[PDB]
Structure formats: C-alpha cells, structure tokens
Amino acid sequence: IDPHGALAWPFFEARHRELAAGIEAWATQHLACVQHDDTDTTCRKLVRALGEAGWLKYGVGGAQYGGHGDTIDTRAVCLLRETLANHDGLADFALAMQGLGSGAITLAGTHEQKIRYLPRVSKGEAIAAFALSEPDAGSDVAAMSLQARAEGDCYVIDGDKTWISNGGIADFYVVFARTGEAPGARGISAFIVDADTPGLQIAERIDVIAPHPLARLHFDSARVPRSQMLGAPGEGFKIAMRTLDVFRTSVAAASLGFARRALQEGLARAASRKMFGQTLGDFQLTQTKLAQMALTIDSSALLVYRAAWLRDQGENVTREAAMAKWHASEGAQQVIDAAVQLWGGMGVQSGTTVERLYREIRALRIYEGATEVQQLIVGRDLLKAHAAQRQQ
Amino acid sequence: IDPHGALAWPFFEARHRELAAGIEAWATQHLACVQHDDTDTTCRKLVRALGEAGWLKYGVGGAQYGGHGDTIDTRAVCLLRETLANHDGLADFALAMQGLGSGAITLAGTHEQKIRYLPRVSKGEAIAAFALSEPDAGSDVAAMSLQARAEGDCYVIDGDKTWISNGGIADFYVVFARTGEAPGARGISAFIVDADTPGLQIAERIDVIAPHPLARLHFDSARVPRSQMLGAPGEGFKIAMRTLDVFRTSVAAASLGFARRALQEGLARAASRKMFGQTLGDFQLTQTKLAQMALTIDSSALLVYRAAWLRDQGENVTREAAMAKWHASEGAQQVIDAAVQLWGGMGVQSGTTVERLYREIRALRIYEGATEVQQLIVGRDLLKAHAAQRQQ
Amino acid sequence: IDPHGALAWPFFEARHRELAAGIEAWATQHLACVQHDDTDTTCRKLVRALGEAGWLKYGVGGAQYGGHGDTIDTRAVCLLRETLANHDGLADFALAMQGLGSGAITLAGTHEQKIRYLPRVSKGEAIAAFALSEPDAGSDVAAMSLQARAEGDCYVIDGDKTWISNGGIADFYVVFARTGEAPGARGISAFIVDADTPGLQIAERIDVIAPHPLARLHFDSARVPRSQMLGAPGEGFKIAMRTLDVFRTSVAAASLGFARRALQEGLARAASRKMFGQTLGDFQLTQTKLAQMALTIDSSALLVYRAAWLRDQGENVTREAAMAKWHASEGAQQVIDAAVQLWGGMGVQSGTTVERLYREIRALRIYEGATEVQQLIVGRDLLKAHAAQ
Amino acid sequence: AHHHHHHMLAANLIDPHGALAWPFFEARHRELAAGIEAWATQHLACVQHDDTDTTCRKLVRALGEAGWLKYGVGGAQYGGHGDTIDTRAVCLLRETLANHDGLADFALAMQGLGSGAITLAGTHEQKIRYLPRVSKGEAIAAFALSEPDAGSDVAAMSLQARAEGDCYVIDGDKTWISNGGIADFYVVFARTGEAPGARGISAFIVDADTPGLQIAERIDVIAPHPLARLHFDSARVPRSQMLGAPGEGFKIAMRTLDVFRTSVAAASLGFARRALQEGLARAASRKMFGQTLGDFQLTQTKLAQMALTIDSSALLVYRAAWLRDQGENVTREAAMAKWHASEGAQQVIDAAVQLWGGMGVQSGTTVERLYREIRALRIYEGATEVQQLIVGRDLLKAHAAQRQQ
C-alpha cells in the first residue's frame, strides 16, 4: 500500500489492488526464464498456465461461459497486460490474444456459440485468433477482399489473411470476409473458423523483430457452415471494430508495462554505473533524462487507467482509448530509447532486457491502429463534439 | 454532468464539482471585458470582487482566520485558478497572489499575526505579496542578500527585492531576509512588512510581456519590529519553500486553464475557417495538431489533479507537483503556440485571445521553480526512492 | 578572417564577405538605439538611410534601374536581412519590404515601369508594398476576391486587402486582383497602384505583437490605367508566386539573424550569471541547451545559404528554399525560446533583447507560406521527383 | 556574373541539385563518389549476414583490391592515398557503403579506425610493417580501447602494461572490440603508470598471434558483426611495438577517434538516405483508401521531415569534413555532425519503418535492418550527450576568449 503508487488512485477499486498483487506474484513465479527459442511451444505453455491460474477469465464476458463477470473489467485486463508485459512480452501476447481472439464471440456469438468456445478459451484449453488484416489491406480494413460466397447452408471462403497472431497454433480463428451485401464496410461478415476446417492452410510463418506465432492464412475454397457466422450477414465490420474497441486500452497498458521495465533498467544502471569519479546518476543530464522517462510513464498510466475506468462506467471511450494507446506506445518508444542510451554498449547487446524491450515496443505503434490513425481518430472526435455543442 | 468531463474523475469530490460550476458562473458574469490598460485598478477591483464572492477563502488556512477550512483544499484552489486563467490571466493572478502572498502567515503566523492579516486577505480587503527574489538571486534563494540586522526590538532591513507581484499595490509583503544565524539557507528569516513601513520604497514598476502589477522594492534601512517576524530567526528559508509548495500544483492548474482556452480557440477557428474549398479542420495536419493539443491538455489535467488529490490526502507531493507544474506549463506553451499557428495572421494580432495567451503563458515556465529546476527535482527524487528500495 | 565563420564557406564569394562586413558596420553605427515608439517615422528614416548607403540596390534587378546586377543576388539579400535582423527587426523589415514590394516590377515590369519605380526604390526614395492577402483568403491565394474590372482604358478596383506591410506609408502597392479570365488561380492580374490613387483608402492600421506599419486597404472603385498592369491579364498569380520565390530564402535568413542574436545573448548571460557558487554556464543543462541552439543555428545557416547559393547558380530552389524557410523560422523560435529561459525573469521583461526576439520571430512562421505549407511543398516535390526517377 | 560550375555541367558530369555539386566538394570527390557507387552496385547485391566473420574477410579483401582502403591510410609511401587523410573522401566512401549494406561500411571503416593510430603516431618502420597490408586489404585492423568498467570514461581504464626489460607485460581485459577474432593486429591502449588518469596510458601494436592474447568470447549485438572480448594473460610485446611515447596513449586514442569522427556521421547519413528511398517507394506504391499512402498530408510532411533531416545532416557532415580538409580543427563542427547525423538517422529510419506498416518490422526487409543497424552509432565514439557537452563547452570557451580580447 504505497500512497505514491498508481494503484492508490481512485480510478481503481479494491479488487484491482488485489488483482495487481496476484498477477505480479504469479509473474514472478512463472516468468523468470521464458524460452524465446521456440515461441510456438512457449505460447502453448503460457496459455495453459495463465488459464489454470484464472487469469484468462478476465478477457471473456459472461460468467456462465467462463468469464470473470458478465462484462469485461477493462481495468483488470489492463493491469494483467501491464504486469505481464513488464515481465515478458510473450506472456503478455498470450493473454492478450485469448481476449482479442475470443472477443467477437463474447460480443456477438449466440448462446451455443458462446458455450462451445468461451469456456475453453477462459480455461486456456483453446487458443484464439483474430483474422482481419490482408496483404493489400491492413489500415484500410473496409477494403478487405477475402471472399465468402454463400452456397447451400455454408459459405465458401477464398483469399488470404496475413500477420495473423497465433497463426499456426490457434484452435480457431475469427475471420472477417466480404460477403458482398453492400460496398466497402457494409458488405463484411464475421465467421468462427475452426483450425481444422478443410481448405484452411497455414501458408507461411512470419518472422518479426519481436518473434511470436504469426502466419499468413490461405483459404482454398474452405466451406464453413453458416451457423458459424457471428451476427448477421453484413454485420462483420462493426463486430471487428467493437472487438478492437474492447481491448484498445489494454494495448496501451502493455506499452506502459514495457515502459515501466525500461525505467527500472535505466534507474538501476544510472545508480550503479561509476564514471568520472561519481555515478552516471549524479549528472544533471541523467537526472533530467530519468525525470522525463518517469513523467512520460505517469502521463501514460493516467491516460490508460482514465480510459479503462471510464469504459468500466459503461461509457464509450473512442477519444480516451485512442489517446491512451497513442501516448503509451509512442511514450514507451521514447522511454526505452533513453534506457538503451543509459546502458551504453550493453543497450544493444542481444538478449539484454533493454535490447529485447527495444524490439517488443516497435510493433505496438503499428498494429491495432497505427499512431497516425489514433491521432486522426482523436482529431475528428474533437471536431465532431465541437459541431454538436454548436448545434445546441 | 458530462461523463467525459474531467470533473467526473474520482480525483474530485462533490464539493469540487459544485465549486467548479460556481467559479465558472462567477467568471462568466464578471470577466466579460477585463481592462488590461490600468492593471493596478483592475487588480484592486478583482481582489475585492473575488473576496466578496467568497473565492479568496480557499487560499487561507483556518476557518477562524477567514479560511474555507483548517487545511488548504488544494483541489479547490486548482479549480479556481484553472477556471479563472481560462477566462482572463489577470483574474487568475489576482486570486493566486492572495494565496501565495498570505500563505506564509497561514503556515507560520502566531494567532495574533493570523488574526491581523488573514481575515482581510480572505475578504479581499488587503492585497497580499510574496517577496523572495532579488536582482542577483532568483533561482538561488539560499544566497539571497537582502540584509536584516537586529537593533533593539526591531530589525533594520536594507537592500532590494524584485519581480514582486502586486508590488506597489500590496497592503503588506511577506519578506525573506538574511539575519545571519548561519551560512546560506540557514541564515534567513521571514517578516511581515506592512506597505506603509517607513523606508520601504517602490524603486520602479516592472514591465513584463503580460503586464500586471510588479515592482522592485527598496528597503532603505526600513525598521520592522521583531514581533513581525514569522517563525524563529533562521527559519525563513523553510517557510518560503513550504509556502511555495502549497501552491505549486495551482500554478500548473493555471497553465492548464490557459491551454484549455487555446484549444477552444483553435477548435473554433479550425471548424469555421474556410479555405481550399473546405475548412481548415478538414485537413489531416489540422486534425492531428488539434489531437495533440487535446492529448497534452488531458495529460496535464490528470497530472495536476492526481497531484492535488494526493496532497489533499495528507501526503507529500514533491515528485507529483513538480511533474504537474513542469508538464502543464511546457505543455500549455505548445498548445498555445499551435493555436496561434491555426489562427494565421490573427494569431499575432494584438488583443486577440491567442495572442494574449502567447504572452501570458511564457513566465509560468520561469517563476515558482523554472522547468529545469522541476526536472532536477523529479530526477533526484527518482534516484532517492530507488536507493531507498535497494536498501530494502 | 575567422576560419570557423560561416562566411568562410565556399557558398560565398569575396563580394559577399565584403558586403557582410559593410552591412555589419552600417548596422553597428546606425542601429544602436532604434525607436519602436513611432514605427511609421522610424521605417521612413530607415528606408532613406538604407537607400543612401547603397544597401537597397541588392533587392532590385538591373543596373540601369538602380540594381546591383542584372539579377538579384540571393546570397547578398540574405546576408543583409540576416545582419539587420540580428540588430533590429524593424531595420530588417524596412529593407525586406523594399525587395518584396518591388520584386514583381523587377520580374515583370516593362522598361517604362522599371524606370518609374525601381531607381527610387533602390535609393530609398519610394517605399514599396506587396498587397496579396485578404481577410478571407491568406494561405488560399487562388481564391482572392478583390475585383479588377476593365472599363475603357482603365481597371476599376473594388474590395479589400489586409495585413499589408507598409500600409499607410508606402508610396505604391503591387496589388493582385481578380480580372476573371478563368476561375481561381487563372483569373488574377497584377497592378501597380500608386498610393495617391483616388479611391484607395487606408481603412485601418493593424497592431501585431512585433509592431510595424501594417494596414487594411479598401479600394472604393479605384481607377488605375491599364498601363499599370504588370504582365498580361491572368498572369497575376504566377507573378505573385515568383516574387515570393525570389525572397523566400531571405525570410529564412532573417530568422537566422534573430536566432544568432538569441544565442549571443544566451551565451553572454550563461557566462556572467552567478548562481549556486558558480555560473549558469557551468551547469550541464545550460551547456547542452547552448549546444542545441548553436546546432540549430548552423543547420539553419547551411540550409539558408545552400538554397541561396543554388538559386544564384541559375537553378530552381523549390525544395531547398522551402526547407530553409521552414527550418530557420521554426528553429529560430526554439533558439529564442531557450534564450528567454536562460535569462529568467529578464527573459519576459519588456525591452530586453530576448523579450523582443520572442515577439519578432513569431509572425515569420506564418507569413510568406506558413510552416505547414512549406512542409507540403517539400513533400510533394519529393514525390514528384520520385515519380520521374 | 560567376557560377561555381560551368564546363563540367555542359559535359553532363554534375547534377546541379545533387549534394555532390556543393562547393564543399572538389572534382576528385565527385569522381570517387561515382566510383564507389559503381563498386557497391556491382559487389554488394546480396551480402550474406549469416557468417559475418567470413563475409567481413571477403569484404576487406575486395575493398583493398579495388583501392578503396587507401583513403583511410596516411602516407603515400605506406600505401595511403595521400600524405594526409582526405576526410571528405572517407565520408563519401562510408556514406555510400552504408547506403548499400552496413557490413560493407563496417569492413572499410575498421580498416581506417584500426590502423589510424599507426598513421598518426607510427614510426617509419611501424608504418612500413603494417600500413601497406592494411591498405591492400591483406591485414584486418582493430582498435582496442573500451573495457567492461570504462567506455565513456577512457581516462579510467585499467588494462595493465608492465615494463619488463625491453618489453611490456600486458594483463587484463578489453571488450566491445570490433573485428575481435578476425583481426591480424590490435591497437591496444593500456595503463603504463607515468602519471594518474589520462596521463598514464600508452598505445601498443599487438599482433593477433601474440602469446597470451585470448579471444575470451564473441559478442552478439542487434546488428551482428565481428565483436569480441579480449583477455591478456601476461602478454609480452616488445617496447618497439609501442605507438608514440610512454604516457601519450590517451592523446593518440582521442586523435584517432577525431580523424574519423565525421566518418561515422557520414555512415549514419548513408543509412538515412536509404530509409528515405524505401519510404518514398512505399508511399508512392502502397494503395489505400482509394488513393496512395503518399497522397495523405501526414505522409507528405513525414517524408518532408525525413529529407530535411537528411539535408541538414549532410550539410553538417561535409561542412565539417571540408573544414578539417582545409587544415583546421573541427572540435565543434565534427561534434555537431556526429550528434545530428546519428540522432537524425534514427528518426528517419523510424519514420520509414512506420510507413511500411507491418512489413516495417518483418525480419529481412530493408527498413527493419536499418532500424537495427543504426542504434549503436548513437552510443559509441562519443555518445550523443558527450558530443553535446563538447559543443556547449567549446561555445563557452570561445566566448571567454573574446571577452578577454
């Protein structure tokens, strides 16, 4: 109970303070030496262990379906990702994808669809995936071209998805395809596609700078039953956006966890590195660099948990979640870059904490709405609200 | 109550939401056309009007001395300055100086000293001033050279103070002078010096870029009874620092108020300025510029009221208040600068709102602990806490 | 000759080194205590004194018309503005407007037009002005609404221009007006409008944060002879843009001069301000702030004089001049802001050098193509060149 | 009037908007830039990053055979291009090589840094023995200065050199040593004890086969290349192998880093230019929202800032290199160039990664490699903060000199 800790803020309830201590204790006991050599196996083990400890319940909505509660506790999910990321980006990834990959089912699935998938997801017995981006269309989601033609009681799916997290190890994929009811964003549908669907191919595994399971998927005329559709034909675009919206602040929270770890490493190095008859921390320039790192972190944390608290009041957080993800991810890049600088040569030595952080942060500014997209979201929302106030 | 408004945050209590509406109503009624030509007269009028409306009680400690309560409600003082600064810098100045100028009496006065000065300050019937800085020493307070030499039951005060807000119109000054008990910061004493003390002269008024009452004071062997000392001989330096600490977040809150006004002006101009067949707000560069203004404002506001909330819980806020004053004042400069840019030539036209803001914000980064000093305070506190953690 | 000075760079020739020494000596003698109380009178005196000393010849093209050479020496004009701004923004302003206000005549005048106006401009005997912007159209020049209507052998001008530098003291205005040959940027024409033209009204003097002569002009059916048109009907937009192109790097040079003055003041204060048992300059943070000021200054100066040198080789400088004006004006704001900070309370005291610089720099990021417009010019040019390559 | 160029322009030998047209350059620099670009396009089409020991050995030999290692060596009779190092030439070589492949830049750069102390402080006999092979690419050079406990603080190094008879006995460790494990000799800086601190250092030429020299471990960094920790177990080297006088090793170390200060900045610029090329290509071809990525204002102004940073860095680099080539000290100008180019290249590369989206962080893309190749150039040969202090202190030193005069 540190009065200066962020957990003392009135954005949090007692259950969040208890949860934060619980996931930190679990992370210390389980993430001391995570093997990045075989990430497929490591992710499978992480999902199982997270499931067994109860941590995957918070990303699922509906207690009867294995959820922690009938709504998703945004503050809890943020605290889980922030803590896991502080310890190991792969553990954060494994928990995050159980939420994002199943979220469309929480939001739009029928009773039987929820019963079939969400208990196993919440227990860590099924690995989930979210398949939206394509080679020619990532930011421009509304122009996706994965085809889903109706034929009988099923849909025949043709084309590719890429950058699919958990690609190759997921037990099912929530897949968004163009069914063609109307142009652009109005002709998309969403499907639950089991990994063993005939016609579903793992076309290639993708290597990124922070390695984790990632694949390009090819659909070779795959037939999935119409009963596997989430929502109504043409409702897929709003389902995708609503799913991303649930977890947007928790992406910001993961960035914050990486940033906090970078400051931990920068502080330890400043305080211990002897140089020029003193320590690195005795120089003004080091002190103000650390101060800016802490300022950025506190700003990020306040924005993250303002947005999560506000969503947990039942409000839409279009502007506040965009601010948090933008600020936390860009801020984490700045904090980590400063920490690398503080560590000197060791800062770029393979395997060190700050060097791994330098790789884990970079992609978070790109996916789930690149920084530029977040800025536009906030700007347009400001002008939208100004216009509404004027029309009153 | 706007669920997206900052007042909904649980940093605030019900009384703060009522106060925020009340001071906004007062400002709307009373600040419609503030006269910047004769600031002596305007400030005297503002102090009286704020006092009569009860708004000066919040910067005074002790109900029996005219204060709102026995302790300073820092969240309330911040809301007062944020609102007043959002309307007019002179109104914020007038309220702020009644707090800063009397705070050493709230903190260190005897009962008789508090009775003689604080009720009039709280009623707006006596204008307060805080005289610490000198021509040769502003940042380096511990080396101040105003002399106070004991003589019988009085002190003979000799030398200058300068940059003194309300100088020339104040009814009293809290003055810090070297009495010499020990070197440096341990040789300073604090005095209440009535403006009619023989030998206290106004050497000159001072013209600054955002004009307001300001003077160089010449103590020309001015004799002050020993009974006008605040505290014990040699305790003056701590009284000065503790007085500044009380109001540090409120300086951040004034910066935030100026920044909010700038975003209001920038938004109105973006939405209404037709150009290139559309409006200025239709351009991406405008939208991302506005988004960054709002992000800096929300970060600043969260830091201000986190710090104020935490201090109101009875905790020291050395790190949090420095973060707030630093981030809000530097942030407001950037927001205001962006609003000037959006307004084009009108942004530098004398008397327009954003042109005034460009002048009003600049000194806030300099006084009450320049930005560079705030950065060092945060950085040294980070290393102090880190060393305390390592010892454990 | 300081080997570390920018004048030693091979962007410059001997005549530029000699010019820089001459204008610096003139400024040191004539700008020791410029009066900002009555800027109309001060500008009139500055124009005459600059003209008498020969410094206004560099902004005029053609020796028979009073100019130094047959073309405008961009490096020379930049060095003049940089030096004058270093000393006093009003002196920089006075010289700058003699160039900008007369440039369209240098560029597009007939022999008779150049004879009538350029000798007087070069001698400081006619104060020039450039009237382009309007209340509803500044950045969006192509949409201007000042109207020029052909009637017999004259044009009748109705409407407003605003933000007009030297408004109220200029002897003539180069005015751009819609003649309507085609929509938008293709229906504009340029006119020389003498200040004594009946119907031309000084509607309002404008006060800005760094004051200087500035007015809104109202044209109440002002009749100007067709022979006062600069160039052909419909050529006005190109003439306005080409005139701004000529002097664009010299706005960057003025910004650089302001920045250099800010560093001089910041260095002087750092070295002499005693605090905490040492000087302000002994702190790491002061040393790195000073370092960043100097780095921004050298990068701006290299960009300014690269662009000016390139234009003086007879080449277009669309990208390079935009880089210079963008970088130098935004950079000068940062350098000046850092100098204000080093001076503490004195940094915001009216009348100190750094306080004046904080006011003098701000408009330069707005006029003659705001920073955002310069950024788009550069980015579009990069993509244009890439599409060819 | 006068134009800088005329007849060569008429011969279509000069691009007037190119940086090579700047009067900071002579005709020989334009020729060299064209030659090294031709060599790079021919020889660097598919650099293998799997076995960097073998690739670097191949690169050094090929660069030497083509004459490009002569520019980093001083003294024509010893294989150098001229009697002094042509700074502008060495910058152009690194800028071009870095633009193509960081390992080719590395291989050339280390031939210069590794032999630079021999050029500056070597006796006639020392230069004859080492510099011809270096300049031919027949000997791989290395520069052994940093220690686990002392990198920025060179004056605090603890490697020991003990005089014994007419030899010196060396004990202790060096680390972060580029070309460690493949070098034929190391210039080693060790404390000999003539005086405390920066005055008790001496420089030695230490052949790789010197008994007692051990390659303790190979170091893996985010942009992999030959790197090792060296351990000296009572290594005996003759007093004749000392570079300069006893106690002069600190000045020799610092002057060698000075000779090549602008050249690291020039490599940073080559990486940044490549990032802009990739950014423009992606912006012009990536279709989205019914137009291209380059049609958005944000993309245009981001590209504009990338080019602005590049042009500012290039002007700073070649201003400094030109000035040093006139025989002047460039304490302030070279520190500006290294600080700005390295921080600037990081920003340019980061922007190019962002323009490429997911592919920006996909292993093997050009921009992903650049994001890794750039990071260490901000840390070594004077971390950014050290350069800032050099500039700020020089400003104050010059200001004080004027106040006296």
Ligand SMILES: Cc1cc2nc3c(=O)[nH]c(=O)nc-3n(C[C@H](O)[C@H](O)[C@H](O)COP(=O)(O)OP(=O)(O)OC[C@H]3O[C@@H](n4cnc5c(N)ncnc54)[C@H](O)[C@@H]3O)c2cc1C
């Ligand atoms: C580690 C990693 C994991 C991923 N996991 C998944 C997953 O699980 N499921 C899934 O569906 N996708 C996933 N993705 C894909 C990711 O969502 C996309 O990369 C992202 O949507 C950007 O799309 P893109 O790569 O096609 O870049 P592009 O669409 O080509 O955009 C490139 C750049 O253009 C900028 N930009 C975009 N829009 C605008 C605009 N209007 N105006 C100005 N600039 C703009 C942005 O800076 C953007 O980065 C993952 C990506 C990565 C790197």
Ligand SMILES: Cc1cc2nc3c(=O)[nH]c(=O)nc-3n(C[C@H](O)[C@H](O)[C@H](O)COP(=O)(O)OP(=O)(O)OC[C@H]3O[C@@H](n4cnc5c(N)ncnc54)[C@H](O)[C@@H]3O)c2cc1C
């Ligand atoms: C509008 C205005 C109103 C004011 N009202 C009052 C008042 O009512 N009562 C009163 O007592 N004073 C008042 N002041 C004075 C103000 O507090 C001082 O200006 C401030 O303390 C700075 O002191 P200085 O002006 O002497 O600057 P200096 O002490 O000379 O410092 C100049 C710069 O040095 C930098 N600096 C300072 N310390 C360090 C450090 N350790 N390391 C690195 N850099 C450092 C800072 O950037 C600082 O701005 C006012 C000032 C202004 C502008």
Ligand SMILES: Cc1cc2nc3c(=O)[nH]c(=O)nc-3n(C[C@H](O)[C@H](O)[C@H](O)COP(=O)(O)OP(=O)(O)OC[C@H]3O[C@@H](n4cnc5c(N)ncnc54)[C@H](O)[C@@H]3O)c2cc1C
């Ligand atoms: C001291 C001063 C002196 C002046 N002297 C003269 C003179 O002598 N002659 C003359 O003709 N004019 C003069 N002007 C006018 C000046 O050129 C205009 O103010 C300038 O062109 C901006 O036009 P505006 O004020 O109407 O702002 P707006 O056109 O309304 O633009 C406002 C902001 O919009 C942004 N913006 C503009 N275009 C874009 C775009 N495509 N995309 C995104 N953002 C954009 C910019 O940040 C701009 O500042 C002067 C102005 C000043 C301040």
Ligand SMILES: Cc1cc2nc3c(=O)[nH]c(=O)nc-3n(C[C@H](O)[C@H](O)[C@H](O)COP(=O)(O)OP(=O)(O)OC[C@H]3O[C@@H](n4cnc5c(N)ncnc54)[C@H](O)[C@@H]3O)c2cc1C
């Ligand atoms: C790829 C790579 C290759 C290398 N190759 C060689 C080689 O061939 N030969 C060789 O001798 N060395 C080599 N090095 C070592 C390199 O020179 C050192 O890492 C560098 O000198 C920094 O020293 P350090 O790592 O001990 O960090 P530290 O000395 O501990 O400094 C850490 C950080 O503290 C900051 N700092 C330093 N001084 C100050 C100051 N006065 N004030 C404020 N902040 C300060 C800086 O940001 C610095 O980066 C290499 C390093 C790398 C990453």
